Write a protein that binds this ligand. Structure first.
Ligand SMILES: *[C@@H]1O[C@H](CO)[C@@H](O[C@@H]2O[C@H](CO)[C@@H](O)[C@H](O)[C@H]2NC(C)=O)[C@H](O)[C@H]1NC(C)=O
Lengths: 111, 131, 183
């Protein structure tokens, strides 16, 4: 369906560290473009969370960090609490289709 | 102060057309690119279209290749998207998201920027295609 | 002619105290700028290269600092964060030509160099084109004391860490940003 492949649902206990993987092909992510990350609270509009594979905009706290290791990037939440039960879409840019791609969405919940 | 409000959703038979609206305020609309993204109800996000700084560079996705048409206007700060020959798989909540700005490289040709995300997203209206 | 020393320089200052160097009443070429593929990013936002051979050399500025590789993406207009809110805020206007290029062998040795500093805590985030060298404690918690650095009272600067065994997004990129003005 979607161009980027990521796990559809992963979760964990509060206070621990969860890795939301986001792997893609060598045509879009591995070609030299930068991943990004969004956070869609249930029923509302998403917001930007991480752009340029490591940054964070004005307002999002220090807990949401990420990386870009070769051809497969990953978001990392440290010290997760009950107020983050939303979805987390990773996106990139593709050179073949000449259009933006998105991810399958990860259902992260608290136990 | 910065927000993108939309209107224009409805119930359309498969085959006739509809115009989508996306108002803009709180920032400078006359220099930043604009992106359209859609969300199928239940499924993930998908990309639709982008319009450049002046209005000379446009791109579309995979499912809308040719049968859509995007156009904006810097005067009243309003972004439009014209559709024709609709199908039953386009029933989705349509967002308009603010893009980044744009650059001229050494060669000197404007290039839409690719490495940036879509910073602030609109509220997003839903369209409904059914029989 | 004038900026043969701002690219080949062996000493670039850190980001929180850069060096705004102006050039005035002397000819410029800008052919040294383009037609060279050694640079990583050569983004220019308002004006176009191979066209700016007009009467613009009335105090052309050239800022210069050093940041990690994937924070060149915050030296765009807008694009808030933590290296553009508190260190170098570009306006939502004509930034001239943001220029960056990889440097792993010049500003980073085998011993894990951390000589470059960047701010982490500052209330009332920066205006466009403003520098903050005031090294004072943050004092975001309790009553204002004389500075004890104990708890909820942080040092305003922090080092980077520039080992040559890091990836792409943790290596120092020597960013130089042109700027232009008229009278
Ligand atoms: C000093 O940096 C400048 C670029 O800022 C370079 O000097 C010239 O670069 C152009 C290509 O950009 C070459 O065609 C010229 O031959 C260079 N000048 C000289 C005198 O060689 C270069 O990277 C650095 N200078 C030197 C001498 O290496």
């Amino acid at each position: 369906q979607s161009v980027l492949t990521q796990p559809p649902s992963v979760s964990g206990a509060p206070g621990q560290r969860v890795t939301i993987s986001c792997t893609g092909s060598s045509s879009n992510i591995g070609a030299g473009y930068d991943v990004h990350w969004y956070q869609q609270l249930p029923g509302t509009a998403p917001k930007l969370l991480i752009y340029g594979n490591s940054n964070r905009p004005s307002g999002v706290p220090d807990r949401f960090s990420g990386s870009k290791s070769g051809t497969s990037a990953s978001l990392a939440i440290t010290g997760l609490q009950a107020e983050d039960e939303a979805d987390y879409y990773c996106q990139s840019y593709d050179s073949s289709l000449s259009g933006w791609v998105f991810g399958g969405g990860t259902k992260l919940t608290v136990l | 102060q910065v927000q993108l409000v939309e209107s224009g959703g409805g119930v359309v038979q498969p085959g006739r057309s509809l115009r989508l609206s996306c108002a803009a305020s709180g920032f400078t609309f006359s220099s930043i690119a604009m992106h359209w993204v859609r969300q199928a109800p239940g499924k993930g996000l998908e990309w639709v279209a982008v319009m450049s700084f002046d209005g000379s560079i446009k791109y579309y996705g995979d499912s809308v290749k040719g049968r859509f048409t995007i156009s904006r206007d810097n005067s009243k700060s309003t972004l439009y998207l014209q559709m024709n020959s609709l199908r039953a798989e386009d029933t989705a909540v349509y967002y308009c998201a603010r893009g980044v700005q744009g650059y001229y490289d050494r060669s000197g040709y404007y290039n839409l920027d690719y490495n940036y995300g879509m910073d602030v997203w609109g509220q997003g209206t839903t369209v409904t295609v059914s029989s | 002619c004038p900026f043969g020393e701002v690219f080949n320089a062996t000493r670039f200052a850190s980001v929180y105290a850069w060096n705004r160097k102006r050039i005035s009443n002397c000819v410029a070429d800008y052919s040294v700028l383009y037609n060279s593929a050694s640079f990583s990013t050569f983004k220019c936002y308002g004006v176009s290269p191979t066209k700016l051979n007009d009467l613009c050399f009335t105090n052309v500025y050239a800022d210069s600092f050093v940041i990690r590789g994937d924070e060149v993406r915050q030296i765009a207009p807008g694009q808030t964060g933590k290296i553009a809110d508190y260190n170098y805020k570009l306006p939502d206007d004509f930034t001239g030509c943001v220029i960056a290029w990889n440097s792993n062998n010049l500003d980073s040795k085998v011993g894990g160099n951390y000589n470059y500093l960047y701010r982490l805590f500052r209330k009332s985030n920066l205006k466009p084109f403003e520098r903050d060298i005031s090294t004072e404690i943050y004092q975001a918690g309790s009553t204002p004391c004389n500075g004890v650095e104990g708890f909820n009272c942080y040092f305003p600067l922090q080092s980077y860490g520039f080992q040559p065994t890091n990836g792409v997004g943790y290596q120092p990129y020597r960013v130089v940003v042109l700027s232009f003005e008229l009278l």
